[model samples]
Target: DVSFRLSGATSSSYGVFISNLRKALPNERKLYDIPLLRSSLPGSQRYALIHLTNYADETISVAIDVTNVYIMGYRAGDTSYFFNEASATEAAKYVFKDAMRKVTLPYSGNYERLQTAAGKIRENIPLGLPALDSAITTLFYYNANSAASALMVLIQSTSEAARYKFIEQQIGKRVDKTFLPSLAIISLENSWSALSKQIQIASTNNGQFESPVVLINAQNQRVTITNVDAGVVTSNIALLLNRNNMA
Candidate 1:
């Protein structure tokens, strides 16, 4: 028999991304949600990992960590993530499709063991961006040891009172911590390099807002600042994030 199974480290009683993730699962499909000790998915185990660690006004970001239980459902499964619960669910809709549609290349419900198992399949599954290579993920991990030293120094949480609202959400303090809900919001733009220079400007008496925000997604190839003052903020925030990857 085959069906969708879910699990994660969360405080919620049901569903995903705390509970909303279940919102996307078709009612026809059902499975128990339990906690596991490792990244290896259990059950029908076609896991759709979502780590929403950051968010900003326009640029959204997410962290992927499916590091869990049981033999994974699909061999070439992806470990994707996003910035907000909504966007996460947006992609959640597709993960099942991916697991279900692909008859070859290790779809859900198939198991193997060596030539069968090895790596964590550390793929990003970004909303539109291609999957992040595990090799890239490795080089970028927290690492053996390791900043834009002043970046965090210049950074501060975007407050509701601020004119440039980095994020326009209600700001819940105790959000459901399932499937690793968001942790921080950021602002960004440009490639990390150009954005790096831009942030130096945001504060060094040039880029206006001084402290931009969330390290928006890196897929941004073209620099797009929504507005002059508020939008310019994106360029610099990315420097902070770009820094996160090199670590």
Candidate 2:
């Protein structure tokens, strides 16, 4: 295993660098198709560290690492090589320069710009409001599993009151037999009501719950309600419903 650290670069720049490097050095089939290196480097404003493992042989390991140095422009520029008790050979230097000329940098492909555009598109997806109503008449049935997952995603995406109203409408639809009510629907209704009351009371008491309630499911499983929100309440309701089914 070879560990290396790269500093003096912004997180975004490092992100671009790493992404380009991955493309340049596509994983070798002889090396079990595993990338020559893996990193725990998080996107930070400061620096990045990377570690490379050689699944094949030490010769391949050194070759890959040395080639990366030139690919990163460390060997070409004013930057000098730094390694623990090791020196770069003339043959390695020649190989590094050759690889550098051959490899393509993904920066020229506008990778970062494309990534930003994709993120913007995801952020702007329009989610519709809950369609089912207790009073509305409909004979067509909706897929319960798909509805549950879709509703959860919508709730997560929307604002406070919108999500609350959506949950309320779902509960009403299930209870009034407008839709077939599952264990999830019932539990969600109860959980929402309970959490809403807690929030209301907390607001009245200067943001403090007078008597905080711990949630214990039908399966005798206990869960402490930590920060209460539409998302948390909805997740707990789903968990309880799944646990009930398993039991």
**Top lDDT model:** 2
Error of 1 at 210 (Å): 13
* lDDT for 170 (candidate 1): 16
Residue range 136-196, candidate 1, lDDT tens digits: 2321231211111111111111111011122212112213321111222322211333443
For every candidate structure, what is the RMSD over all alpha carbons to the true structure, in angstroms?
Answer: 19.6, 23.3
The digit string of per-residue lDDT tens for model 2 on 87-186 reads: 2232234333434322221221121332343343212322222222210111012232232232222222111112233333343232212233333332
- lDDT values for all models: 0.24, 0.28
TM-score of 2: 0.21
Off by over 4 Å in 2: 1-184, 204-206, 214-222, 226-247
lDDT (Cα, 0-100) at 152 in candidate 1: 14
Count: clashes, candidate 2? 0
**Weakest ten-residue segment in model 1 by summed lDDT:** 146-155
Question: Which one is best on TM-score?
Answer: 2
Residue 112, candidate 2: C-alpha displacement in angstroms: 56
TM-score per candidate, in order? 0.20, 0.21
